[PDB]
Chain A
Amino acid sequence: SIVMTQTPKFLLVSAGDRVTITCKASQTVSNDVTWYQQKPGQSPKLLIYYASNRYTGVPDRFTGSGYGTDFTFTINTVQAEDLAVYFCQQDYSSPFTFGSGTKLEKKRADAAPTVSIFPPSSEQLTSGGASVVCFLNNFYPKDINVKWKIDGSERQNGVLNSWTDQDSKDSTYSMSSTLTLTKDEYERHNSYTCEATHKTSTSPIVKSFNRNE
């Protein structure tokens, strides 16, 4: 089974510069390489086939090249409509494997997250559960780490995270982290902390509360 390794997983681009995506096959694959573009909610759209042949209606900015193992997909002048995910695919042999994809995202200036922590509500505690929630809003770039602490000790189980896509207005990212526990375990402890680790600062942003108050 031939493995296709798509070099860049993500690319922060501004309108006007060249993007270059690489795709390396585990075994020789001749010129049987295809490049697709995919927008959210849609199927993949064919862009390049036979390594370098442009499909009907594909603009001149897109270009494919390569033979054997190393293949290249270039956008010469990136336009805003080109923000999407791009995939390579080999046709040489079954199962005609796809690359992992490269997501193009809009470039902007770094921004620290604004962090907020929320204790469990009275209603959930009445139901028998207890969720502590931490919002990490409007940061850039997307890479971010969230550590939970109970009474000063790290906690990993019962943690569910969710990330938004790039904001359409300010091009930032947001994240929600929820730590769920039983009510009894929650009432056996006092300090609840979420710590945010992001490129914008060498020290984490620590938000916490006490059941003590």
Chain B
Amino acid sequence: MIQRTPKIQVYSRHPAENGKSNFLNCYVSGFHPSDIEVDLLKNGERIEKVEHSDLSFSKDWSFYLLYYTEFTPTEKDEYACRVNHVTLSQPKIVKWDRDM
């Protein structure tokens, strides 16, 4: 029972500047039930070896997770997060914006 769609934020660990190492994070939160599929994308292609935190939840019982991987931003590389959930008919892609 109960179906809550995930909220998604995609962002870097530190302020992005081209040429220096950093971490790309996808924070998914506020969803139910727990089964979810999260991929990080570099120019549309899935990045392998992305880590993810352990399943936890907020005071309202909705779950949250943090997927993350090391990355070096460049001027032309496009990054995104693709999220699939039982509440989504098709995966949702959120592009990474260095200003957000």
Contact = CB atoms under 8 A, between A and B. Distances in A.
Direct A–B touching, Cβ under 8 Å: yes
Interface of B: 1-3, 5, 87
Interface string A85-110: 00000011110000000000000000
Given A30-B1, A92-B3, 12 more contacts: A30-B2, A31-B1, A32-B1, A32-B2, A91-B2, A92-B1, A92-B2, A93-B3, A93-B87, A94-B3, A94-B5, A94-B87
B53 to A, nearest CB: 26
Contacts, number: 14
Contacts of B1: 30-32, 92
A131 B19 CA distance: 79
Nearest to B1: A30
A31 B3 CA distance: 12
A91 B5 CA distance: 13
A92 B87 CA distance: 11
8 contacts: A30-B1, A31-B1, A91-B2, A93-B3, A93-B87, A94-B3, A94-B5, A94-B87
B6 to A, nearest CB: 12
Contacts of B2: 30, 32, 91-92
A32 B1 CA distance: 7
Nearest to B3: A93
A200 B87 CA distance: 52
A31 B87 CA distance: 18
Contacts of A91: 2
Interface string A144-160: 00000000000000000
A169 to B, nearest CB: 48
For B1, B2, B5, B87, the residue with the greatest tally of chain A CB atoms inside 10 Å of its CB is B1
A91 B1 CA distance: 9
A94 B1 CA distance: 13
Contacts of A92: 1-3
A189 to B, nearest CB: 58
Nearest to B87: A93
A32 B32 CA distance: 14
Contacts of B3: 92-94
Contacts of A32: 1-2
For B2, B3, B87, the residue with the greatest tally of chain A CB atoms inside 10 Å of its CB is B3
Interface string A15-35: 000000000000000111000
A93 B5 CA distance: 9
Nearest to B86: A93
Contacts of B5: 94
A166 to B, nearest CB: 39
A74 to B, nearest CB: 23
Contacts of B87: 93-94
B90 to A, nearest CB: 16
A92 B4 CA distance: 8
A29 to B, nearest CB: 9
